[PDB]
Amino acid sequence: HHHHHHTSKIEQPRWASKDSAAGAASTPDEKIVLEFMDALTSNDAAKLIEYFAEDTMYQNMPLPPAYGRDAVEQTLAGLFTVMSYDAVETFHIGSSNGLVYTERVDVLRALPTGKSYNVSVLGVFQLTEGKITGWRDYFDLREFEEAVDLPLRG
């Protein structure tokens, strides 16, 4: 057992829009996506899986994809077994052609080591009838694994 290490503060990047509504939901899809982002810090796969359609998918791109609502919940619950969201900060959100995009920072804690890290993420959300039919998050896995001593690949 390891004590909970220091949760680093979420800083506003130089390149982040200063006060514009680049961070605000402009469409109903974007508002859903922003609400999903708020739901992440609950660390509850039950709460999260309700946003998804049956025909959906989910992939953290350095890790294997999950296709289908059933595989998505297995993957979400799986990650919540070793990892926990402490904060999600969304700098830029936008949408075209049925896709939402979020440039954000995820503050994660690795349960087994007690350590914490701020992951720079760009993610894309596919919506249909108000439901998430795809979610892909792009980020560097090695820098996260090494910062919190939690290798996830394989």
Interface contacts to a copy of itself, rule CB under 8 A: 14-15, 17, 19-22, 26, 57, 59, 61-62, 65, 67, 92-99, 101, 103, 120-124, 126, 134, 136, 138-143, 153
Say how far apart CA 59 and CA 76 lie, in whole Å.
10
Question: Residue 10 or 25: which CB sits closer to K ion?
Answer: 25
Q: Is 106 a catalytic residue?
A: yes
Options 44, 55, 137, 149, the catalytic residue: 137
Question: Residue 29 or 116: which CB sits closer to a copy of itself?
Answer: 29
Nearest approach, Cβ of residue 3 and a copy of itself (Å):
29
Nearest approach, Cβ of residue 145 and a copy of itself (Å):
9
Say how far apart CA 87 and CA 118 lie, in whole Å.
9
What binding mask, one character per residue, do residues 93-132 give for K ion by CB under 5 A, x or -?
A: x--xx-----------------------------------
**Does the protein bind K ion through residue 26 (CB under 5 A)?**
yes
DSSP per-residue string spanning 91-146: EEEEEETTEEEEEEEEEEEETTT--EEEEEEEEEEEEETTEEEEEEEE--HHHHHH
Chain breaks in the chain (C to N over 2.5 A) after: none
Nearest approach, Cβ of residue 19 and a copy of itself (Å):
5
Q: Write the burial class of residue 12 (CB in 10 Å: 0-12 exposed, 13-18 middle, 19+ buried).
A: exposed
Say how far apart CA 82 and CA 85 lie, in whole Å.
11
Number of residues that bind K ion (CB under 5 A): 4
Q: Is 140 a catalytic residue?
A: no
Catalytic annotation, residues = 106, 137
